[PDB]
Design a protein around this nucleic acid. Sequence first.
DNA 1: CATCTG
DNA 2: CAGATG
Length: 327
Amino acid sequence: ETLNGGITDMLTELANFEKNVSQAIHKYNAYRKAASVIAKYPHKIKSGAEAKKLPGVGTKIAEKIDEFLATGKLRKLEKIRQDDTSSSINFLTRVSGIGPSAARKFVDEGIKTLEDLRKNEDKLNHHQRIGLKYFGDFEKRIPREEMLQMQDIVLNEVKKVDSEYIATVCGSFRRGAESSGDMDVLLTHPSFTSESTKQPKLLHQVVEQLQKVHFITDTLSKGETKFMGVCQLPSKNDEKEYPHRRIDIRLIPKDQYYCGVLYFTGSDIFNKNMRAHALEKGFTINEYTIRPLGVTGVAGEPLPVDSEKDIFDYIQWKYREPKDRSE
DNA sequence: CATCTG
DNA sequence: CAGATG
Ligand SMILES: [Mg+2]
Ligand code: NA
Ligand code: NA
């Protein structure tokens, strides 16, 4: 946790770089388990050879750890922290919609910058376009003080369109957090489920409304169950308008709301532990359901959940207010 | 995993 | 349809 920090970090840099610049998935994937194992490792890795000793730890990584341990640095690491090529790929990628893949093309075309992008607004696709347009706003965290207003907003519109809607804002916002990075609303309706054959309108009608009233500004992607967009709190009495914020809306069949809701609320850490315990308690958990774990090895059959309560109960656990779902 | 591009 | 993104 700090005993092998630098090690795990450099390894991180290293891995990262393989996947993103080079297309080195194998290698990349290599650095990964390695930093993972050295991570769990209990003592102070005083040397390469010592580390080698670990699974996932071969000759090259060892060699690396050595140089690093021997000197406060790594050449290759330093060669990579320079190379404008490597750097550009790390940056272009900050643009929502631009992945590595793309980040590569652009560079090999000479687009290595924000300006490069603007000038070449043509090569960019819609999502990337927006992405570009809101670069700044996209990076700005979301203070709960807005979050509350936002939520206040979605909730009132979802309601008006249908009394039967059930909206929920998950995420860290849901978990207490003072600021979040994007709004994520869970959504269901009684009239939509596991079996029930579809109802796209279920998702579209609302989406509409939100943009009706102008909360939704752009559309990144809008499928029949997942909508990815841009929103923004109405700038009051002109002087101070709000940043544009990322937001996603997802339709969920009423029969798996809470698991989805539970799940989305996180944290990851709250998850696993929740997951792991459920396993003990003779169960199974994932995004949509909870299943009584048979003995023959495994087994399914969606136990019935009417609230986050119904879940905990199942695994016979202490109901956790969203706040305390931290770890 | 769902959506989009081309 | 593969392949990319979030
Ligand atoms: Mg968040
Ligand atoms: Na990106
Ligand atoms: Na292939």
